[PDB]
Symmetry: C7
Subunit: 22 residues, 7 copies
Amino acid sequence: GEIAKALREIAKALRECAWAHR
Amino acid sequence: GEIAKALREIAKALRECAWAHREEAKA
Amino acid sequence: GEIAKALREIAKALRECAWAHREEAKAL
Amino acid sequence: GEIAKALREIAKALRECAWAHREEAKAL
Amino acid sequence: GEIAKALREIAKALRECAWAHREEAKALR
Amino acid sequence: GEIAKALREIAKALRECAWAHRE
Amino acid sequence: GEIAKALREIAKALRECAWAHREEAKA
């Protein structure tokens, strides 16, 4: 579903926020 | 749908927040 | 719809958090 | 609706997180 | 509702993240 | 509900993000 | 459900964000 896909996109962005902290 | 579209906008904003932190790490 | 509008408000707030943090990075 | 109200509360809290950074930006 | 209650719990957690950021920044003086 | 449980998990994770900077 | 699974993925990402911030603070 499109909503689930967007939520996974949100998670991916948050993983970027954590990896930026590298 | 517009809910999914708004959620994608949130993801986009969070990628900004990632970009800002990278600029923080380099500063 | 009201939920979509609230979600966009969340996105706006997060753009406001990115802006504020860039200013921290520039203040440092 | 209650869900939209809670989502707006989340946006408001995130504007607080921005505020916290701005106060820092003006200090630092 | 349970979903709304959980979302409010998220808002509360974020207000805690704002408070913590403010104190961390002040702890670094 | 499963969605409500995951949302509470998100809240719990955010409290960890707060404790990290308290730490 | 797929939505609940995605939300749990978001929670997991935020737990990453706490681990990363904690190490930043200790570094």
